């Protein structure tokens, strides 16, 4: 009922994940920006990292690499790195042209895209769903809002519930 702003975004992501009855691993908010293209004159919507909330629940070379990257990130900013943690981390550098990829298709068409089960992810033909599935996710969800797209992921197979959709409706802006 009250139009939310960026200053409560982290709180609303936390509220979504901590209050949900199902075991969601994380939530991401993909925010809108625009990329003006000089060659066509088009102002295209681009979805990029807004914020996220990771709740949670690999070979040596991979672990050393991941731990190394965390160390380097710790440095700039100021033991095991799990697959879902890594997926969440890597997500921060992703962006999506409107209509393209899981968040882009959701936003273009103002859609709820609910992919539940490994086969739904790998059969979606959607690169981000495929990536989630490789990192152990079994449910991925994108819900378009007035300001972008809310994404949920889980390592469990989760069916769409009324209660989850009610919470999302109360925690983001809709037209």
């Amino acid at each position: 009922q009250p139009q939310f702003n960026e200053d409560t975004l982290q709180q609303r992501l936390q509220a979504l994940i901590e209050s949900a009855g199902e075991n969601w691993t994380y939530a991401i908010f993909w925010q809108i920006s625009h990329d003006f293209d000089s060659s066509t004159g088009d102002n295209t919507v681009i979805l990029g990292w807004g914020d996220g909330y990771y709740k949670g629940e690999t070979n040596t070379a991979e672990q050393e690499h991941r731990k190394r990257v965390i160390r380097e990130l710790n440095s700039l900013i100021s033991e095991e790195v799990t697959d879902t943690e890594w997926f969440f981390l890597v997500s921060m550098t992703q962006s999506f042209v409107n209509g393209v990829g899981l968040p882009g298709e959701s936003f273009l068409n103002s859609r709820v895209i609910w992919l539940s089960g490994s086969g739904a992810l790998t059969g979606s033909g959607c690169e981000r769903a495929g990536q989630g599935q490789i990192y152990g996710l079994k449910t991925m969800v994108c819900i378009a809002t007035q300001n972008g797209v809310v994404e949920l992921g889980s390592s469990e197979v989760i069916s769409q519930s009324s209660d989850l959709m009610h919470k999302v409706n109360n925690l983001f802006n809709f037209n």
Binding site: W49, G52, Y54, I70, L73, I77, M92
Partner: peptide
């Protein structure tokens, strides 16, 4: 680093230590 990402990184890395 974009502010949005750095802010999230900060919170993520800090929650990591627990």
């Amino acid at each position: 680093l974009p502010i949005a990402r750095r802010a999230s990184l900060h919170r993520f890395l800090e929650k990591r230590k627990d």
